[PDB]
Amino acid sequence: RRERMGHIELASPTAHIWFLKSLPSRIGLLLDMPLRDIERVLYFESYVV
Amino acid sequence: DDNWEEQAANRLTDAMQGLDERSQDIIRARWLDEDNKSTLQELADRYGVSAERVRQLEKNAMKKLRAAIEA
Amino acid sequence: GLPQADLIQEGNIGLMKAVRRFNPEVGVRLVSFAVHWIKAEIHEYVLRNWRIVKVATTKAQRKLFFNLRKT
Amino acid sequence: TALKTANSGYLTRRLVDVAQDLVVTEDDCGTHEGIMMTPVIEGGDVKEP
DNA sequence: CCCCCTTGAAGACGTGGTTTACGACCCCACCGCAGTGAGTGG
DNA sequence: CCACTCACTGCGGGGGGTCGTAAACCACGTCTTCAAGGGGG
């Protein structure tokens, strides 16, 4: 019981906070998008084309 | 605890060697076997003895077993 | 002590159940009909999440959970 | 006295972490260069011979 | 003191008939530091 | 135009009513081996 791991199937995809909020942001740098716009899109405040 | 239980088992084995051949199989079958637990009647037919005779034989054999162990 | 957002969503599911089982010919407003369904979903969520382990499971325990607070 | 010990310990930890992996590994190297050693004098007083 | 009975019953192990009981589901009209970012103005 | 901040951020020291299943049994019983005693100093 100290070695066996489980898993949870997510109904919808979720972003990893380490690759988002740890400066410099990896997702923002890869997408060349501002971090604020990514945060707004992720937490359901605006749309993205 | 493992050391204490191992040295007590060896005393049982040494004591069982002093028993007669017929008495050893009586104790071994009923008490030492794990797959089967031989009853009084089953040992009676194998050696042609009475049902009480098998039961009465264990008492004397166990006294000898205790005497060797306690000494 | 439970989050307000979690309680709201539990009630939303209860509201949908009352809507699916609404008879317009009775003449009563949906507000009075759905009040029993919404509070039933919230009560069940509090029982299962008030502590790390469920406190009330049987019939008698559930009655005492909501009455001992006032008594 | 009560407050300087934490700063001393932090500086010691930083020095140990930066310098921890240096070990003498060779008997001799083929270099010929070096540094110039001279006595130090400040204000006309020979501080160190 | 080896041997086969006796003879009366004490407990021994299920056992799923019989019967509660649990659990679940349904309705309810400081500290200084450094890297970042706009944000100018040019 | 890229220079030159400066505000910003992050880092260390509530009701009732049914149903199914692993508990939860009290009877259930017949098996075991409990055995009273039997004889060879």
Output the DSSP codes for B17-32: HHS-HHHHHHHIIIII
| Residue B18 CB contacts under 8 Å (≥ 6 apart), including other chains | B64, B68
Give the relative orientation of helices C30-49 and C4-20 as an angle to the nearest 10 degrees. Answer: 140
Helix (H, G, I), strand (E, B) or coil at D48: strand
Report CA-CA distances (Å) from D7 to B67, D3, D15, D41: 75, 8, 12, 31
Spatial distance between the Cα atoms of D49 and D37, rounded to a whole number of angstroms: 10
Encoded amino acid at B44, one letter: A
Exposure letters C2-13 (e unless 16+ CB within 10 A, then b):
eeeeeeeebbee
The answer to whether C57 and C37 have CB atoms below 8 angstroms apart is no
* C53: DSSP letter: S
| Residue B26 CB contacts under 8 Å (≥ 6 apart), including other chains | B43, B54, B57, B58, B61
Nearest alpha-carbon partner for C3 in C32, C53, C37, C42: C42
* D41: DSSP letter: E
Asked if strand F comes closer than 7 Å to C48 Cβ, the answer is: no
Asked if strand E comes closer than 7 Å to A35 Cβ, the answer is: yes
The answer to whether A41 and A48 have CB atoms below 8 angstroms apart is yes
Helix (H, G, I), strand (E, B) or coil at C50: coil
Give me the phi and psi of A8, to 5 degrees please.
-125, 130
Give me the phi and psi of D40, to 5 degrees please.
-105, 130
CA of D26 to C1' of F8 (A): 50
Burial label for C1, CB within 10 Å (0-12, 13-18, 19+), is: exposed
Spatial distance between the Cα atoms of C18 and C26, rounded to a whole number of angstroms: 14
Nucleotides in F strand less than 7 A from protein CB: 10-17, 32-35, 37-38
* CA of B41: nucleotide with nearest C1': F33
Helix (H, G, I), strand (E, B) or coil at D42: strand
Asked if strand E comes closer than 7 Å to B70 Cβ, the answer is: no
D48: β partners: D40
Give me the phi and psi of D41, to 5 degrees please.
-130, 130
A-contacting chains (≥3 CB pairs under 8 Å): none
Asked if strand E comes closer than 7 Å to C57 Cβ, the answer is: yes
Nucleotides in E strand less than 7 A from protein CB: 2-6, 22-24, 27-29, 36-38
Query: What radius of gyration, in Å, describes the C-alpha atoms of chain B?
Result: 13
